[PDB]
Design an enzyme around this catalytic site. Structure first.
Site, PDB file in Angstrom:
ATOM      1  N   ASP A 175       0.794  -1.218   0.072  1.00 18.45           N
ATOM      2  CA  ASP A 175      -0.052  -0.186   0.110  1.00 18.45           C
ATOM      3  C   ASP A 175       0.955   1.236   0.062  1.00 18.45           C
ATOM      4  OD1 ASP A 175      -1.858   2.096   0.278  1.00 18.45           O
ATOM      5  OD2 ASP A 175      -2.416   1.412   2.493  1.00 18.45           O
ATOM      6  N   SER A 191      -0.771  15.706 -11.903  1.00 20.25           N
ATOM      7  CA  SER A 191      -0.808  15.365 -13.323  1.00 20.25           C
ATOM      8  C   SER A 191      -1.253  16.476 -14.233  1.00 20.25           C
ATOM      9  CB  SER A 191      -2.068  14.235 -13.397  1.00 20.25           C
ATOM     10  OG  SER A 191      -2.580  14.035 -14.728  1.00 20.25           O
TER      11      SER A 191
END
Ligand SMILES: CC[C@@H](N)c1ccccc1O
Ligand SMILES: CC[C@@H](N)c1ccccc1O
Length: 330
Positions: free
Chosen positions: A35, A199
């Site tokens: 994770d 992004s």
């Protein structure tokens, strides 16, 4: 040193991925959910409340000659999905794919929430976010990667998650045969303890690319792609009959639909998520309404590039003094 381990979807929906991890001496192999959005290595154990164990493999520290109770240490964690667990702490030898750390903090669960109990395929979590998020008290502990870093050939790990297939986590090296083209690296902020990056935009299907900054985290422990409501609405508007359902808890779409791809930007590069990766199947057995793999982050507080996005890429988690992330197509 290096390590390399195969990671396997837990079910036909790629809900999560499990990777075998050797703990203790002799080894006890548990299948952990790696994770990158958390920083605790915790396991089902011989100390876990018996009624909260339903098919998981447990770690039994009393059977490990290298286990040592970390005196006074406790831990307690709550995840973004509302699940939680807590317990005490041992140090022990932990190996992943041939890479061994001695003295790793292994957090033994005394209590786990119902979603963990009800899922028999996941024996615990192995956190790969920054150690500043580790919950052990009163002395915070380091992640497996942080403990291994100095010994690794290069201070990196890579995630190569499969679509409906096995994949690989590598530590200490970048397998140049595992991706196409080049890896584009992008800046990371560690201020929240995550692999947080920005992004450069998105496209829906064959549509034009929209240049826009989308801050989010690279999180292998989250199943879906959580993005701003504007972006998610633009995606689902291209699927006839798709709608946001308050009762179901997100966007659903007719199972007869063909889904468009979704592209996200990494610098000037582009990662294309095929439409099929965005299908999470009937909302309940036999339903013709299917649950979408791109959902709004509006109720989270952060955008999350979970498995839906990451499995479309070869992803480099560069833990150099100034960390960065890398993405390549594959
Ligand atoms: C299943 C996809 C394949 N490239 C692969 C993935 C993981 C381990 C070994 C392999 O042969
Ligand atoms: C219908 C799909 C549903 N169980 C789901 C929702 C969110 C994340 C993973 C999942 O598989």
């Amino acid at each position: 040193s290096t390590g390399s381990a195969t990671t396997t979807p837990i079910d036909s929906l790629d809900d999560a991925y499990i990777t075998p991890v050797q703990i203790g001496t002799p080894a006890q192999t548990l299948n952990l959910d790696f994770d990158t959005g958390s920083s605790d290595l915790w396991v089902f154990s011989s100390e876990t409340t018996a009624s909260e164990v339903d098919g998981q493999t447990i770690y039994t520290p009393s059977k490990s000659t290298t286990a040592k109770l970390l005196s006074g240490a406790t831990w307690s964690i709550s995840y973004g999905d509302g699940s939680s667990s807590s317990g005490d702490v041992y140090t022990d030898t932990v190996s992943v794919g041939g890479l061994t750390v001695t003295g790793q903090a292994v957090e033994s669960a005394k209590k786990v929430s119902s979603s963990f109990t009800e899922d028999s395929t996941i024996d615990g979590l192995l956190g790969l976010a920054f150690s500043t998020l580790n919950t052990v008290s009163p002395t915070q502990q380091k992640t497996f990667f942080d403990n291994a870093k100095a010994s690794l050939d290069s201070p990196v790990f890579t995630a190569d998650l499969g679509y409906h297939a096995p994949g690989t986590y590598n530590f200490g090296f970048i397998d140049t045969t595992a991706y196409t083209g080049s890896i584009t690296y992008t800046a990371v902020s560690t201020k929240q303890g995550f692999w947080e990056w920005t992004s450069t935009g998105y496209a829906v299907g064959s549509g034009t690319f929209k240049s826009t900054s989308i801050d989010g985290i690279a999180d292998t422990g989250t199943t879906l792609l959580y993005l701003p409501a504007t972006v998610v609405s633009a995606y689902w508007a291209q699927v006839s009959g798709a709608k946001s359902s308050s009762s179901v808890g997100g966007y659903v779409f007719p199972c007869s639909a063909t889904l468009p791809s979704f592209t996200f930007g990494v610098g000037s590069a582009r990662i294309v998520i095929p439409g099929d990766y965005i299908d999470f199947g009937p909302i309940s057995t036999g339903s013709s309404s299917c649950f979408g793999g791109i959902q709004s982050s509006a109720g989270i507080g952060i955008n999350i590039f979970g498995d839906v996005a990451l499995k479309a890429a070869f992803v480099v988690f560069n833990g150099a003094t100034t960390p960065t992330l890398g993405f390549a197509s594959k």
